[PDB]
Design an enzyme around this catalytic site. Structure first.
Site, PDB file in Angstrom:
ATOM      1  CB  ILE A  17       3.909 -15.150  -2.280  1.00 32.41           C
ATOM      2  CG1 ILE A  17       5.173 -14.320  -2.569  1.00 32.41           C
ATOM      3  CG2 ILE A  17       4.233 -16.631  -2.153  1.00 32.41           C
ATOM      4  CD1 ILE A  17       6.296 -14.463  -1.525  1.00 32.41           C
ATOM      5  N   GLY A  18       2.297 -12.629  -3.881  1.00 27.93           N
ATOM      6  CA  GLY A  18       1.582 -11.374  -3.730  1.00 27.93           C
ATOM      7  C   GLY A  18       1.688 -10.502  -4.965  1.00 27.93           C
ATOM      8  CG  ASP A  19      -0.046  -8.722  -8.718  1.00 28.55           C
ATOM      9  OD1 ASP A  19       0.398  -7.564  -8.869  1.00 28.55           O
ATOM     10  OD2 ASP A  19      -0.246  -9.500  -9.673  1.00 28.55           O
ATOM     11  CG  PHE A  22       3.009   0.845  -8.657  1.00 28.02           C
ATOM     12  CD1 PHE A  22       3.129   1.661  -9.770  1.00 28.02           C
ATOM     13  CD2 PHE A  22       1.965   1.073  -7.776  1.00 28.02           C
ATOM     14  CE1 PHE A  22       2.225   2.682  -9.999  1.00 28.02           C
ATOM     15  CE2 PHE A  22       1.058   2.092  -8.000  1.00 28.02           C
ATOM     16  CZ  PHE A  22       1.189   2.897  -9.112  1.00 28.02           C
ATOM     17  CB  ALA A  23       5.678  -4.450  -6.261  1.00 21.70           C
ATOM     18  CB  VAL A  24       5.051  -9.249  -9.339  1.00 14.85           C
ATOM     19  CG1 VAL A  24       4.570 -10.692  -9.256  1.00 14.85           C
ATOM     20  CG2 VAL A  24       4.224  -8.471 -10.351  1.00 14.85           C
ATOM     21  CE  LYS A  40       8.273  -3.715  -3.576  1.00 16.70           C
ATOM     22  NZ  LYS A  40       8.247  -2.809  -2.394  1.00 16.70           N
ATOM     23  CG  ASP A 132       2.634   3.809   6.347  1.00 19.34           C
ATOM     24  OD1 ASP A 132       1.580   4.282   6.825  1.00 19.34           O
ATOM     25  OD2 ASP A 132       2.635   2.938   5.452  1.00 19.34           O
ATOM     26  CE  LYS A 134      -0.753   1.066   7.626  1.00 17.71           C
ATOM     27  NZ  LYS A 134       0.194   1.754   6.704  1.00 17.71           N
ATOM     28  CG  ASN A 137       3.349  -0.758   7.585  1.00 14.45           C
ATOM     29  OD1 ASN A 137       2.944  -1.567   6.748  1.00 14.45           O
ATOM     30  ND2 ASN A 137       3.234   0.555   7.422  1.00 14.45           N
ATOM     31  CG  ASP A 154       4.785   0.099   3.738  1.00 10.99           C
ATOM     32  OD1 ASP A 154       5.333   0.488   2.687  1.00 10.99           O
ATOM     33  OD2 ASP A 154       3.601   0.373   4.027  1.00 10.99           O
ATOM     34  CB  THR A 171      -3.053   5.299   9.119  1.00  9.15           C
ATOM     35  OG1 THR A 171      -2.491   4.491   8.077  1.00  9.15           O
ATOM     36  CG2 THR A 171      -4.448   4.805   9.442  1.00  9.15           C
TER      37      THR A 171
END
Length: 311
Positions: A17-19, A22-24, A40, A132, A134, A137, A154, A171
């Protein structure tokens, strides 16, 4: 991937569902409950030499148990990969919470800041700074009655505060003055970030917009303007709260407790609930993949972004 039996026995793993670098991330339905999570997967070959930046994020996720946080459900460690069963929150992020909201009012904004401040309060009780915080997140958790709750995710920049920190992370829009000045900072940067968000919640644009160096000067000076006519029909209690959250003086600045104890957040009658806030227009002008994006990222994906003109 050879998913361990421990995982495949109690979870049905599905499509990716996401890549990330450093993580799949794959679908992950708990067989017993049919509850949908995210699996993850981190390849240990990429994290070698910097085991600590992954291990420090996970050991925090392992500890933090709070409803307003994207939780680590389970961990499975094997010699080649690290498997993390994570909460998959599909209600979109904070910007979606505002847009999707019909009859959007001060009471909704106050409700979200309550979830956020509560989460921050919990982390700060454990001497954890998130660094982080924001809108990207902050994921939306929709309940059966239609009500919503925010979950902070996150923890790629999260760390234990033992003394003043000096790394210039975060950010630019949400970064606190003390981070920019490199004079040493701690937990209350999360409050500053939350104050910027609260400001955006009420009007849909940042309090500090500035060119890059002008933005940093605005942050450093910390003079919050509540321009007309956008802040004409916003409660002074709210504007007062935001003022206390965006104080350059760290000691004068509110703690997470002092935000929660503030009437606009504490007393759930003060927030205006009949006159709406036309914020949807400004958000687009200035700013379920949202849930996956928060999980696909790691500590190793984080980079410095703030660069003053060297004095």
């Amino acid at each position: 991937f050879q998913i361990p039996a421990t995982i495949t026995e109690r979870y049905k793993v599905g499509r990716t569902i996401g890549d990330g670098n450093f993580a799949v991330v794959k679908e992950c339905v708990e067989r017993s409950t049919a509850r949908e999570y995210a699996l993850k997967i981190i390849k240990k070959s990429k994290c070698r030499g910097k085991e600590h930046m992954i291990q420090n994020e996970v050991s925090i996720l392992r500890r933090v148990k709070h409803p307003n946080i994207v939780l680590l459900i389970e961990e499975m460690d094997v010699p080649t990969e690290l498997y993390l069963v994570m909460e998959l929150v599909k209600g979109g992020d904070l910007f979606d919470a505002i847009t999707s909201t019909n009859k959007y009012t001060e009471r909704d904004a106050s409700g979200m800041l309550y979830n956020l401040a509560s989460a921050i309060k919990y982390l700060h009780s454990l001497n954890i700074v998130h660094r982080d915080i924001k809108p990207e997140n902050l994921l939306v958790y929709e309940h059966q009655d239609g009500s919503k709750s925010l979950k902070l995710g996150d923890f790629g920049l999260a760390t234990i505060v033992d003394g003043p920190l000096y790394t210039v992370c975060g950010t630019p829009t949400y970064v606190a003055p003390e981070i920019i000045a490199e004079t040493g900072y701690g937990l209350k940067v999360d409050i500053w970030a939350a104050g910027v968000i609260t400001y955006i919640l009420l009007c849909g644009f940042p309090p500090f917009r500035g060119d890059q160096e002008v933005l940093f000067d605005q942050i450093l000076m910390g003079q919050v303007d509540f321009p007309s006519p956008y802040w004409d029909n916003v409660s002074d209690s709210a504007k007062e709260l935001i003022t206390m959250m965006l104080l350059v003086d760290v000691d004068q600045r509110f703690s997470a407790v002092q935000v929660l104890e503030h009437p606009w957040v504490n007393d759930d009658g003060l927030p205006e609930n009949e006159h709406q806030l036309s914020v949807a227009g400004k958000i687009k002008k200035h700013f379920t993949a949202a849930g996956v994006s928060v999980i696909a990222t790691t500590a190793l994906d984080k980079e410095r972004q703030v660069f003053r003109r060297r004095r």
